[PDB]
Design a protein around this nucleic acid. Structure first.
Ligand SMILES: Nc1ccn([C@@H]2O[C@H](COP(=O)(O)CP(=O)(O)OP(=O)(O)O)[C@@H](O)[C@H]2O)c(=O)n1
Lengths: 1112, 113
DNA sequence: TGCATCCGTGAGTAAAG
DNA sequence: TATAATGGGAGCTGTCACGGATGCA
């Protein structure tokens, strides 16, 4: 088809590498390609330099580190449930100070997980993503005091867990306090410890409103630095013996130790810029020549007094400004956990250094690598920011990699997050998308990196702008922080240009976010594109400018939920971003150089390049993702094709010829339909199932272990007791189901026998045995069957056995068997559909084609959306899309409509006119006039003011078609819909919330250990929670008996539930219940707290609910 | 009034603080068992330090540690630092925590189930 | 008799996890 | 069962409002 595109804004630069935040952060933190001598003091190298040397006398010093090659490649790690990682070696040397002996060795510290090409990780076989974290940037801030208006708080914040917060405050009594580790003491003492004298403080602070006198204390200057230092140590350590070296050590570690105190390099820069000073290191003070020398404290006190008095050039700081919030990317977070593991390793090192035969101590004899290994393994397996990767579709993974969280280790606790953090700050413009955030509890705390945004080396988010000199728009692009951005008048990207010159007299621009009408002389920069304000997902919404933000959010988020369809299509209306998303997500395959295609296969493509070399690309085929969606690549070239560099070789999942294909293009009619699309429900045509639209492949993994027992071994076997051949039909010789079988609920996938628990058969069992003369077998059936409501076709079996090459299982297990079951899911009643504009609904009715409203030429519509979903939601974009889709149906073309820069109404009307010609002149030629029903609809439309009276039938139908509306016939009667109906092509996705996965029911099943109440969850065959509020509902109805059932017979009245089941299977009425077991647990847990709880009768005489079983 | 002081400390039935083999042969267990073990180790060492006539600093230390053991058993976290298992920041779950809160016995298993 | 100040405690439901 | 050895490390922090007990002037 033809791809017409709209838009008048040329984009100077393309979108940056969309996963660059992840990949570049980790590359910087590892420096694996840098030869050791050339490394910078950043990342894990900086961690090493911080931990080493290790002293006390012996010394252990660090020369360099090196990362070897991964023991196994990525696919092998995914299969074997291994971590994709590199060995970490560190070259260390021991030195005895007195002996001078120097022993040197390269010691092995374990493994570090490597990041894959697309910016993800493979931990224990499952892909994971480390989510960037947003936090308050280190530095010196000045905030208003919420109690005292004319007073201000000075706060000095280092990196997370790199020192204490320090507050300076002007008390009501005039003295300046310093809060540290929650201890308020007069700052004057610490100023004295720094070597400051009353002369210097008087000449430095005398200018300010006599405030310096609140700093004047005679008893402090009466003592030298040492006496003030000991005074401070006593004020900070009640009870600790105030030794001299003890106090020096404590104060140094608190204020000047670069191994304990650390502003970020960003904290360093921001303190320098705020206080107008220069810093030597990243600490507040230093230890020089035996004494303490100030760096930050006096500048901070000066700024504080100046802001308090009111001298100009001093302002309180906005702590939600994106010049004061920075991002902690993958590399920084992993480096922090690495630094903690290193600290523990160093503690162990000194521990072993003190003792031990000091004649023979090598580096290998001093390093226990286990604490470091454990810290890294913890970070990657159980951190709040280490998330199971979302790979429902490729856009899922991309969005996941580009998400920013304010939660997690070092971040905010929920319910401790007011409006301020969750607001979209003015400085979010161009940096953090304003719509892509969750609805619910996390709103405003999980966000997305804007599409043109990059994170600089200091961790602040930067957005690009064009330079504007004398009304001329250069192609020089400048990436700014929000602090930098606030200095300029920045025009809007849509301001009209002739050539490179601003062609408008009045220009819409921003100054510190404030919108302002300005002349071209005043314009300093200009936005790169509207695309730079929104996330990648939001940038996939055509006609975004016509959609209320609350529904754009939903459509944005729900693209992440789209299921790869076997016949997926790209939308007939695109934003122009659908190809970059496929490319950057590493979904599809591309040609590495110009070449001719040698071989093409369902499994592999072989290319001959210009170098004469033969390169073979294997194709991933029907692979199971974290969410169970199928990830297969299909080849799109043919034998002998000439391909240039970057040409498509294979379509990934949810890709159609390199275009992001998250759903189907269906033909939509927007009208009610007999209530079956009431309140967002959707009606679809069976023709969609017929031609396998909205059909998706899903793979489930089942796993079983056979382990050694104290009662004998489990074993995977075909020899399972008490089962017919009917039950064992599709099981191979070894007991594992055969590839290709169709497995339904209850079918065995893997046979297994377990030795019975020690048991004397009840006399009933003995007599039944004697009657039937059959010994009870030693083992019992413990086979892995298909769970309720699941099944499909077996496609893979993995078997690992102890004693087999390359295989070693965890202690105890003899063998492990995994079965992969595929299923082809057609759309069904209950599945969820949605479009990119926030219109979502669940398929409620699938009609046969002859019931579907059809166009006069016999063509039935695909889905019927209800118009009542539009006005309240204000997502008119889906309407315009539909209109354009209509034209595209008959012209046979697709469109690219950039957001805010796309197709307008007149151009859609031109296209619709052309389409109407194709739609109706065909009819007029084929020898048919206007239909009687068309005349009746035209009369109705004429009364509605939709067509002008006195025009011909064809002219009026053309008028309606220009409004996007057509005549529509009811399939059930052949009479027309009394009005003309909006019909057109819409892009609709099938979301991951399919009813096959959610339907669940239970009569009886597993109970919990202590509570004896049903387990929860479909996987546990669990019961529904009938919680406090459901109880209130039953109470308010006065359903005393229904409620008592919930509380006893159906949950944890043991005797009650047993007796109820027996009565029902016998056909009797259920018995009166008795005490719920969890109340007995309450009585006993109160007894465990030395509280006697006694059930009495009306005579105040005790009643035993334990039936004597616990009274001696 | 003196009953607000404990001489004999009660021990919950073992099924209410199980030691169960999970599917696969490993063991899972309630935190009350580690709290009771702390208590019993410190109490036994106190009985031995008494029988062996120890100085006053030592018996005082033992008695302080015993009071805090009981406190952690009953209302861990209430006074002082909360007792944690080795190699984890998670507080152990005492009897008060079992009784109260959103996940406590009343709201989780008695007023709804 | 009155205030500041500190400590303890609670902050939605179901689902999956 | 015997050189002598003699006081510890980790804090970690963007609510919030109320209610009730303690602390000062
Ligand atoms: N965190 C959450 C998320 C969802 N819910 C429940 O799910 C519904 C969402 O309403 P809704 O937003 O879907 C109402 P909508 O259909 O958009 O507009 P309308 O008024 O024109 O009908 C609510 O009625 C809640 O009871 C909740 O309790 N807590």
């Amino acid at each position: 088809m033809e791809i017409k595109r709209f838009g008048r804004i040329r984009e100077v630069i393309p979108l940056p590498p969309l996963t660059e935040i992840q990949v570049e952060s980790y590359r910087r933190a590892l420096q694996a390609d840098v030869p050791p001598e050339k490394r910078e003091n950043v990342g894990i190298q900086a961690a090493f330099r911080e931990t080493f040397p290790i002293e006390e006398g012996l010394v252990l010093d660090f020369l360099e580190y090196r990362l070897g090659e991964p023991p196994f490649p990525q696919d092998e790690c995914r299969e074997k449930d291994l971590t994709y990682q590199a060995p970490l070696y560190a070259r260390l040397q021991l030195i005895h100070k007195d002996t001078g002996l120097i022993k040197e060795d390269e010691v092995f510290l374990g493994h570090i997980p490597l990041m894959t090409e697309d910016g993800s990780f493979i931990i224990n076989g499952a892909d994971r993503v480390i989510v960037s974290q947003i936090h308050r940037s280190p530095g010196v801030y000045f905030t208003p005091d919420p109690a005292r208006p004319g007073r201000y708080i000075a706060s000095i914040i280092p990196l997370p867990k790199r020192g204490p917060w320090i507050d300076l405050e002007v008390e009501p009594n005039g003295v300046v306090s310093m809060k540290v580790n929650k201890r308020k003491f007069p700052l004057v003492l610490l100023l004295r410890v720094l070597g400051y004298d009353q002369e210097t403080l008087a000449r430095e602070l005398g200018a300010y409103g006599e405030l310096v006198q609140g700093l004047m204390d005679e008893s402090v200057f009466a003592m030298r630095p040492e006496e003030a230092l000991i005074r401070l140590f006593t004020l900070l350590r009640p009870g600790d013996p105030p030794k001299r070296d003890k106090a020096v050590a404590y104060v140094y570690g608190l204020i000047a130790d670069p191994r304990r105190y650390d502003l970020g390099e960003a904290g360093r820069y921001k303190a320098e810029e705020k206080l107008g000073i220069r810093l030597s290191g990243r600490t507040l003070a230093r230890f020089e020549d035996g004494e303490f020398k100030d760096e930050v404290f006096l500048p901070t006190l000066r700024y504080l007094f100046a802001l308090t008095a009111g001298v100009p050039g001093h302002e309180v700081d906005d702590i939600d400004h994106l010049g004061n919030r920075r991002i902690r990317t993958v590399g920084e977070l992993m480096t922090d956990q690495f630094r903690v593991g290193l600290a523990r390793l160093a503690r162990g090192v000194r521990e072993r250094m003190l003792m031990g035969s000091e004649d023979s101590l090598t580096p290998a004899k001093l390093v226990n690598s286990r604490p470091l290994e454990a810290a890294i393994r913890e970070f990657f397996s159980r951190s709040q920011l280490s998330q199971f990767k979302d790979e429902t579709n490729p856009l899922s993974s991309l969005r996941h990699k580009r998400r920013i969280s304010a939660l997690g280790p070092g971040g905010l606790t929920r319910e401790r997050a007011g409006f301020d953090v969750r607001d979209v700050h003015r400085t979010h413009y161009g940096r953090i998308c304003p719509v892509e955030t969750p609805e619910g509890a996390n709103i405003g705390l999980i966000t997305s990196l804007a599409a043109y945004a990059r994170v600089d080396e200091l961790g602040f988010i930067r957005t690009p702008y064009r330079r504007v000199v004398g009304g001329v728009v250069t192609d020089e692009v400048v990436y700014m922080t929000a602090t930098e951005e606030d200095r300029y008048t920045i025009a809007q990207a849509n301001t009209p240009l002739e050539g490179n010159r601003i062609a408008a007299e009045r220009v819409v621009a921003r100054r510190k976010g404030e919108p302002v009408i300005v002349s071209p002389e005043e314009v300093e920069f200009m936005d790169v594109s509207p695309k730079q304000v929104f996330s990648v997902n939001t940038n996939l919404i055509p006609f975004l400018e016509h959609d209320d933000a609350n529904r754009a959010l939903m459509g944005s988020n729900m693209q992440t939920q789209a299921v790869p369809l076997i016949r997926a299509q790209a939308p007939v209306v695109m934003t122009g971003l659908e190809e970059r998303v496929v490319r950057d997500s590493l979904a599809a395959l591309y040609a590495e150089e110009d070449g001719e295609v040698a071989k093409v296969d369902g499994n592999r493509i072989v290319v001959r390049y210009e170098d004469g070399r033969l390169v073979e690309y294997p194709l991933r085929r029907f692979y199971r993702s974290n969410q169970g969606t199928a990830l297969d690549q299909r080849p799109r070239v043919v034998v002998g094709q000439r391909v240039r560099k970057g040409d498509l070789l294979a379509d990934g999942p949810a890709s159609e010829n390199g275009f992001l294909a998250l759903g189907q293009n269906v033909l939509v009619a927007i009208m009610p339909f007999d209530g079956y699309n009431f309140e967002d429900a959707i009606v679809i045509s069976e023709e969609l199932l017929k031609r396998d639209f909205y059909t998706s492949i899903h793979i489930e993994r089942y796993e079983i272990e056979a382990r050694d027992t104290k009662l004998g071994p489990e074993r995977i076997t075909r020899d399972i007791p008490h089962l017919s051949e009917a039950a064992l039909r599709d099981l191979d010789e070894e007991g594992v189901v055969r590839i290709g079988a169709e497995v339904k609920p209850g079918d065995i996938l893997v046979g297994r026998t377990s030795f019975k628990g020690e048991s004397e058969p009840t006399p009933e069992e003995r007599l039944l045995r004697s009657i039937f003369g059959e010994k009870a077998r030693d083992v019992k059936d413990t086979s892995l069957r298909v769970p309720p409501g699941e099944g499909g076709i077996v496609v893979r079996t993995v078997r690992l056995r102890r004693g087999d090459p390359g295989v070693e299982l965890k202690p105890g297990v003899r063998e492990v068997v995994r079965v992969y079951v595929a299923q082809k899911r057609k759309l069904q009643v209950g599945d969820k559909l949605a479009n990119r504009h926030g219109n979502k609904g669940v398929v409620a009715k699938i009609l046969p084609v002859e019931d579907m409203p059809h166009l006069p030429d016999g063509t039935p519509v695909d889905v019927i959306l209800n118009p009542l979903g539009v006005p309240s939601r204000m997502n008119l974009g889906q309407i315009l899309e539909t209109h354009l889709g209509l034209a595209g149906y008959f012209l046979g073309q697709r469109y690219i409509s950039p957001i805010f820069d796309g197709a307008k109404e007149p151009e859609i009307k031109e296209l619709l006119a052309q389409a109407f010609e194709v739609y109706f002149g065909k009819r007029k030629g084929e020898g048919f006039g206007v239909d009687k029903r068309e005349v009746e609809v035209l009369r109705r439309a004429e009364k509605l003011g939709l067509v002008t009276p006195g025009k011909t039938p064809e002219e009026q139908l053309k008028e309606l078609f220009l409004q996007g509306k057509v005549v529509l016939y009811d399939g059930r009667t052949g009479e027309p819909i009394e009005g003309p109906i909006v019909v057109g092509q819409m892009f609709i996705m099938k979301l991951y919330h399919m009813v096959e996965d959610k339907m669940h029911a239970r009569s009886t099943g597993p109970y919990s250990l202590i509570t004896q109440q049903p387990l929860g969850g479909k996987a546990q065959f669990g019961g529904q929670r009938f919680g406090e509020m459901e109880v209130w509902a039953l109470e308010a109805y006065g359903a005393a008996h229904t409620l008592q059932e919930m509380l006893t017979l159906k949950s944890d009245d043991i005797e009650g539930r047993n007796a109820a089941y027996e009565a029902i299977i016998k056909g009797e009425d259920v018995p009166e219940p008795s005490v719920p077991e969890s109340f007995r647990v309450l009585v006993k847990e109160l007894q465990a707290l030395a509280l006697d709880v006694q059930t009495l009768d009306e005579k105040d005489n005790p009643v035993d609910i334990f039936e004597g079983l616990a009274s001696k | 009034p003196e009953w607000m002081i404990l001489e004999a400390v009660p021990v919950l039935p073992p099924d209410l603080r199980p030691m169960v083999q999970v599917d696969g042969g490993r063991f899972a267990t309630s935190d009350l068992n580690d709290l009771y073990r702390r208590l019993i180790n410190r109490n036994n060492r106190l009985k031995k330090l008494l029988a062996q006539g120890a100085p006053e600093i030592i018996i005082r230390n033992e008695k302080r540690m015993l009071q805090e053991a009981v406190d952690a058993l009953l209302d861990n976290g209430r006074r002082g630092a909360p007792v944690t298992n080795p190699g984890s920041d998670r507080p152990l779950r005492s009897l008060t925590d079992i009784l109260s809160g959103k996940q406590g016995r009343f709201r989780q298993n008695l007023l709804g189930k």
